[PDB]
Design a binder for this molecule. Sequence first.
Ligand SMILES: *[C@@H]1O[C@H](CO)[C@@H](O[C@@H]2O[C@H](CO)[C@@H](O)[C@H](O)[C@H]2NC(C)=O)[C@H](O)[C@H]1NC(C)=O
Ligand SMILES: *[C@@H]1O[C@H](CO)[C@@H](O[C@@H]2O[C@H](CO)[C@@H](O)[C@H](O)[C@H]2NC(C)=O)[C@H](O)[C@H]1NC(C)=O
Ligand SMILES: *[C@@H]1O[C@H](CO)[C@@H](O[C@@H]2O[C@H](CO)[C@@H](O)[C@H](O)[C@H]2NC(C)=O)[C@H](O)[C@H]1NC(C)=O
Ligand SMILES: *[C@@H]1O[C@H](CO)[C@@H](O[C@@H]2O[C@H](CO)[C@@H](O)[C@H](O)[C@H]2NC(C)=O)[C@H](O)[C@H]1NC(C)=O
Ligand SMILES: N[C@@H](Cc1c[nH]c2ccccc12)C(=O)O
Ligand SMILES: N[C@@H](Cc1c[nH]c2ccccc12)C(=O)O
Ligand SMILES: *[C@@H]1O[C@H](CO)[C@@H](O)[C@H](O)[C@H]1NC(C)=O
Ligand SMILES: *[C@@H]1O[C@H](CO)[C@@H](O)[C@H](O)[C@H]1NC(C)=O
Ligand SMILES: *[C@@H]1O[C@H](CO)[C@@H](O)[C@H](O)[C@H]1NC(C)=O
Ligand SMILES: *[C@@H]1O[C@H](CO)[C@@H](O)[C@H](O)[C@H]1NC(C)=O
Ligand SMILES: *[C@@H]1O[C@H](CO)[C@@H](O)[C@H](O)[C@H]1NC(C)=O
Ligand SMILES: *[C@@H]1O[C@H](CO)[C@@H](O)[C@H](O)[C@H]1NC(C)=O
Lengths: 778, 778
Amino acid sequence: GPDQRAQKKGDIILGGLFPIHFGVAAKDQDLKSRPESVECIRYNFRGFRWLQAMIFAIEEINSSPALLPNLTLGYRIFDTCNTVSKALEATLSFVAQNKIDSLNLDEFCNCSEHIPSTIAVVGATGSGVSTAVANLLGLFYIPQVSYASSSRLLSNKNQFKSFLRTIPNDEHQATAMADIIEYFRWNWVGTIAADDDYGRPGIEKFREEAEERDICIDFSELISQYSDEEEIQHVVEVIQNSTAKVIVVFSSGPDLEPLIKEIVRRNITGKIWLASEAWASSSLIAMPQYFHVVGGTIGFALKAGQIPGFREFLKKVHPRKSVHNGFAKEFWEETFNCHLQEFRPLCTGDENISSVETPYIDYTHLRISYNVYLAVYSIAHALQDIYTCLPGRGLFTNGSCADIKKVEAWQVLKHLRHLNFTNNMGEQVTFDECGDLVGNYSIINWHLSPEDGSIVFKEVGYYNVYAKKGERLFINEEKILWSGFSREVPFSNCSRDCLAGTRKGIIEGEPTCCFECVECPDGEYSDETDASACNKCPDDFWSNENHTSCIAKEIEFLSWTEPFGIALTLFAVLGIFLTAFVLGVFIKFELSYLLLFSLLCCFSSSLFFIGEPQDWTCRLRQPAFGISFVLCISCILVKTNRQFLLVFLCTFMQIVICVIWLYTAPPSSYRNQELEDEIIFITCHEGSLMALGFLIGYTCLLAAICFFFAFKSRKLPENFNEAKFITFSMLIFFIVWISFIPAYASTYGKFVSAVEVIAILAASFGLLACIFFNKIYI
Amino acid sequence: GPDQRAQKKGDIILGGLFPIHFGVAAKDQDLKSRPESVECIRYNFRGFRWLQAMIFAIEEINSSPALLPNLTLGYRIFDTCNTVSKALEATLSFVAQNKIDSLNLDEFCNCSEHIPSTIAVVGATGSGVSTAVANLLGLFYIPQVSYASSSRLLSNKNQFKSFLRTIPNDEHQATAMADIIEYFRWNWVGTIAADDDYGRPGIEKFREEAEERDICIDFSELISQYSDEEEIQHVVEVIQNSTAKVIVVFSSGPDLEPLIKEIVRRNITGKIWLASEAWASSSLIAMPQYFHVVGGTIGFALKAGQIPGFREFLKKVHPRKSVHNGFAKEFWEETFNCHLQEFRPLCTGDENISSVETPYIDYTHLRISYNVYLAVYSIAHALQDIYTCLPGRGLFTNGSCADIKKVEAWQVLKHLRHLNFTNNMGEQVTFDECGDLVGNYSIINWHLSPEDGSIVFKEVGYYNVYAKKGERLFINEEKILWSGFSREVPFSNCSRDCLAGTRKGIIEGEPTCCFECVECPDGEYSDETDASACNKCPDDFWSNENHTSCIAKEIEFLSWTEPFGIALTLFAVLGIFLTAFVLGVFIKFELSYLLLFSLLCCFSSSLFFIGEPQDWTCRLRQPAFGISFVLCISCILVKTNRQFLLVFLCTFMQIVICVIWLYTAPPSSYRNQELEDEIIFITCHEGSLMALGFLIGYTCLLAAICFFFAFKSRKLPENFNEAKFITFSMLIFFIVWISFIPAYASTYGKFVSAVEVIAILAASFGLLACIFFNKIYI
Ligand SMILES: *[C@@H]1O[C@H](CO)[C@@H](O[C@@H]2O[C@H](CO)[C@@H](O)[C@H](O)[C@H]2NC(C)=O)[C@H](O)[C@H]1NC(C)=O
Ligand SMILES: *[C@@H]1O[C@H](CO)[C@@H](O[C@@H]2O[C@H](CO)[C@@H](O)[C@H](O)[C@H]2NC(C)=O)[C@H](O)[C@H]1NC(C)=O
Ligand SMILES: *[C@@H]1O[C@H](CO)[C@@H](O[C@@H]2O[C@H](CO)[C@@H](O)[C@H](O)[C@H]2NC(C)=O)[C@H](O)[C@H]1NC(C)=O
Ligand SMILES: *[C@@H]1O[C@H](CO)[C@@H](O[C@@H]2O[C@H](CO)[C@@H](O)[C@H](O)[C@H]2NC(C)=O)[C@H](O)[C@H]1NC(C)=O
Ligand SMILES: N[C@@H](Cc1c[nH]c2ccccc12)C(=O)O
Ligand SMILES: N[C@@H](Cc1c[nH]c2ccccc12)C(=O)O
Ligand SMILES: *[C@@H]1O[C@H](CO)[C@@H](O)[C@H](O)[C@H]1NC(C)=O
Ligand SMILES: *[C@@H]1O[C@H](CO)[C@@H](O)[C@H](O)[C@H]1NC(C)=O
Ligand SMILES: *[C@@H]1O[C@H](CO)[C@@H](O)[C@H](O)[C@H]1NC(C)=O
Ligand SMILES: *[C@@H]1O[C@H](CO)[C@@H](O)[C@H](O)[C@H]1NC(C)=O
Ligand SMILES: *[C@@H]1O[C@H](CO)[C@@H](O)[C@H](O)[C@H]1NC(C)=O
Ligand SMILES: *[C@@H]1O[C@H](CO)[C@@H](O)[C@H](O)[C@H]1NC(C)=O
């Protein structure tokens, strides 16, 4: 190892593993000369104060005699600047005295220094570093306690048997990560993890919860602090080639830094951020030059801790007082940008500690330092439980304890598996077989000190864990500033929630977070804006133009009080009045009475076939044939071959045909539906041929009888050409009955029945005129 | 470490890592007492002879002075019974003297033993074990040479910098694994890998090649030697719940053993096997009790090797000669099932070596032992190149070599990166930056010694690697015995290659290895048995009943020589003969000549409208109207009001109407298509109303003229009721022309034209009879 160490002697050595530099240099060895270790060129003041938080509690235990009397404590602490290489290079020296059973060819000085073996060890930050170092110490059962390693792979106790945490596991952070977008009500998001044991398994767990809550994922990407610049530009083009305003960033501190500088050069705005706790308080990331594109940044953190005298101990520093710190002189030079020696100028070693801005001392809270501060205490308190072994009631076979002068790491781990004691601020730190405890999380926003631009972290709520699901989370939303200032919550669903008129269809391949919306046709009336399917209307309605609630009814094919038909009804009334005047002339000055009365009935027949149709109004078309067949009695009575009341021989035949037809054909108005929107009509639905047979048996039978009896009398003037007038009236009635047929066969609705009505009225008026006017006016 | 070691002193220590036991015991430590290492209860004679192959070549280098004179060689070899735990427990003692710069608190005896550091080390078998141990030695650049670790993760030189192989990599085995089922012509298979660094990445590479060659995968499963018995039953139920006769097993030796015993209890047969080379020669697996369900087992292996004196050295064994072997006495007791000491009886230490069946000595070839035997030599030959450093032309800065008494592992690795020398049997072992070489593979079958039942491994070909793709592989298939004895190659496609009549459709979700097949309808004629889609027929064909090549033609609606129409044509000929007899009587004993001639033309008119239709045969229906209008001249000439040659006044009108119609309507036979299979007809397609207008203007005009001229003469007998006969003939012709209309309007094809033909013939025959017979017979 180097001189870069932290070591004081003592009865039991502890040692620790700490990131004094974020990034390592990455030189390529070439084997032409003697290879050597690599200097790691970055810094972490938070790591240096983590060292201070270690050694302060160390000296607390040494000074306090209530905590392990007659026992000075050693340590041999090394820097692991985020490489498993130097982590292994350190921990091989940790597995040293236990290798005396393996390396025993040093017999002449095998107990010269007589070193106590490093009994336990404070772990390391990065999950990859801890998983690398855990496999070695699982062999010797040397208990290793991490403080920041927070991946669920280490919860396995098959491989990692000698591993404990003073930090909660990651499943609850994945749970709250699902629940925050649940409460924030989104379905469409893309995430970015780190390509190691911290990012990948936790983002896999978040993928589990995302498909539990049916939240579709845009993308899942991986970066590191050694990522390729083309790959960073590639994933940035992936971001700009897609759309999800929220992003689950689930990485450590310095791994985002190249991507972050690249993005602030790329000047992408609008996308907002979700933070894992490994970078949710990242001072090197939290910079006001980056607060244009970061901000509104929501994350989690641990609760604060309290250490007495600690700020004073942090300013109890001096480079020629670093008898147990190799890193302190380099820290002094690096803070003061100079070159002390026993470009960069000299250093006086006497400057003010609280003079310059540094995250070493300009903190607000104690979280991971607090975890270390209680971690070394929990080691010491399990050790204290060994120190007061109950005489015969230890944690061994038969409770048979051993001495404290010869204590072994497996005994230490056995007592560490059952350690039931409480905090200095009164919290029972108690280990399950997951090797940790669990606490709550704060929930912050990256706000801004507006006059200074220092990115402040306002608590906007928290996440309890001690409740159950659907119950653990509370956010006061009333201090959230989305995109740093916008009070309104933004939009991150993929497809828009469409309006009322278009029902929400589905695209193949893409799930429910991004759909399509299609306006259904022809009776759509889709009322709700976000129902996936619409309904079809009932009978009395048709769709709106904007396909809203269908109210447009059907047709009104009745022509009852229609102005086109009312004038024809008035003309029929005038014809009836002319017939009344002719009968009044015939009365004042069988053919005289009944031929006039049956003609009046044939005139009044079609007037009972007008209006909105019904049962009786439908069956009243049979009297339009019967009264015309009765009015044809003059055509048989007034022939030149003129017992006269024997018109019953055809009247009863027509009546019997109608009595059969009343049960054969339908005497009921038939409301058909020909069109779609306006289709309400009435057409009476006669049976198959009943009306045609009755018409052929009455009308064109009596007219043909009159024509066959007057074919000889047409060339015969008698009673002032009354035979000529009768033949002309018979021809006119036959012409009207012939012309009414195709206009009934080629029509519909209110265009069909009016033709038959007007034709019957016209034929009656013509025959009545050609008889009565030529009779009377002379 | 234990006494279970292999150690002789020497100037440079080497050491190795070897599986003396397949499985370890898996006791759970409970920390109530002193924990300790676990005894591993299995054995591997192949591992023991691998130790022998190490130490024999070691003593060869020591005895040979041409190979490194004045240099005895140490070793410190340990057993790694397939656990990374004991592998690490070994290799911590390997990184020992290099830790003097780290552990320097042993100053009073830091050079007492003055141990030379273990300069290089022969690696280990299992890929997980080698990847575990490689990360440690990559730090110190101690070159480690494996011999069996064959995963492509170790081809990376970023992490594993100090790693070399004397075994080819796995990409070519995955390539040949794709090519063997390519040549064996399958598309549907399910695989089983081992759940570690050997199985998983290679089976991932095979998945790449499977989707390259478009070979769909049934399943990809993972087992170990610590698999769950319910999981083994679960994957066996997965096998029985699916179907693929070939199985890519891609694991080590003992990991299949629980699954294999479970399967031979489960008694699944029919499935055949593909072997990776890690178990393709697995003697503990190759058992005759298992050769019922295994057999036909195809795999790969390395070529054999040759070591002189080696069989004698293997039988140069004695337990009280094991001065550098801790495992040898246990090997002696384990072979002889006894208990030597200085139930199981005593051991004499003097039994015959070649007395019992054991895979220690009952081998056939040298493959991995050969790899070790050349591996230690390649270490020694790079060391020899260091020994004759060219004075100033080494592999350093300026070629500046160092001494052999103080040699470092980075110098050794530098010379190992450039080592260009040849085998004892003359093959240039030369390392690229993949840290290996590449050789061919044999391709075997697990045959049977039929009288002894020992599963013999007949070579059934090989796999060259030095060619390119599509070129590297040759199999003589003529010794393959599928399922151990069946000469025919079996079937493992998912869906069957269907017959000709059903075109191959596609199922959603499942790719081309498993499809559907559907018989297309209505002109299918799908000729090829394995074309995905069919075609539709040309016009002159319709489909077969079994939907094969469509040959069934269309209809023959001509009725030219039809027996139903030939009798009617003969009746028309008899009517023409009767007309000829009547004209002969009228000649022997205008109406006399032309009314007979035009009647003969009207008789012969329809006879030119019979047969298969054509242009002139289609236009010959106009003469059927013209000659009938000419034959109606008697109806105007023979009236009772009887200049006579003025029939031209209507003949020219009919001719001008026909001359207009010849250009108006189509004078061409119209082959319609009404049906589907048999639809070939002829219907002449007249224009819109031309034939109807010409018929109304000629036929029912002349007949109505005759009727209006004879309505008074019907009650007038003259010339023996010739007026009555003429009126009856006119009524008959009008009745025939009226009856021919609906039978033409409601028919088709050969049912329509024959009606008009027979009606014209009947009307002509009736009119000619009613004139001529009543004229002549009196
Ligand atoms: C974004 O989409 C989600 C679902 O994809 C919407 O959540 C639904 O909201 C409606 C009313 O807002 C609720 O009745 C549903 O129960 C919610 N879905 C689920 C699964 O609970 C969310 O409203 C959408 N937000 C925006 C702004 O479009
Ligand atoms: C973790 O969060 C919970 C929040 O549910 C805290 O519970 C509070 O406990 C105090 C003391 O009993 C109560 O007065 C509060 O009403 C609780 N808050 C609730 C119910 O919302 C709890 O203190 C937090 N810390 C720990 C260590 O459990
Ligand atoms: C199993 O299926 C494969 C393909 O899924 C078949 O291989 C095809 O065979 C035909 C003729 O046998 C060739 O014309 C094709 O070129 C082959 N396909 C490819 C992709 O090359 C194979 O014949 C099938 N075997 C059985 C027994 O069904
Ligand atoms: C690897 O396999 C190839 C097979 O392609 C072997 O090549 C043979 O080489 C000999 C010697 O030159 C020729 O006589 C043969 O005709 C080759 N076989 C062919 C072309 O099929 C080769 O020997 C094998 N071994 C090595 C180490 O390359
Ligand atoms: N939990 C992280 C370590 C970590 C937590 N907080 C951090 C802050 C900075 C750097 C690393 C961390 C891991 O598993 O790797
Ligand atoms: N290649 C194997 C090791 C191996 C090769 N052949 C073997 C035979 C038996 C056991 C193991 C092996 C691995 O990577 O793990
Ligand atoms: C970055 O985007 C913001 C958003 O409008 C814009 O105001 C600013 O000018 C941009 N800066 C650069 C350098 O493109
Ligand atoms: C009592 O203790 C001794 C030594 O600690 C041990 O050997 C013995 O098994 C124990 N007996 C019981 C019953 O625990
Ligand atoms: C031991 O743990 C239990 C858990 O409920 C707790 O009640 C008890 O107070 C603990 N004992 C001590 C001494 O703290
Ligand atoms: C195993 O299957 C074979 C295949 O037919 C059969 O002959 C044999 O009897 C079976 N054995 C058992 C134990 O089921
Ligand atoms: C020559 O060798 C010395 C020592 O080996 C070295 O320092 C020097 O750089 C070398 N010069 C060249 C040009 O290689
Ligand atoms: C070195 O390698 C080359 C590679 O082609 C070979 O030709 C040559 O023979 C090798 N040298 C020796 C000494 O074997």
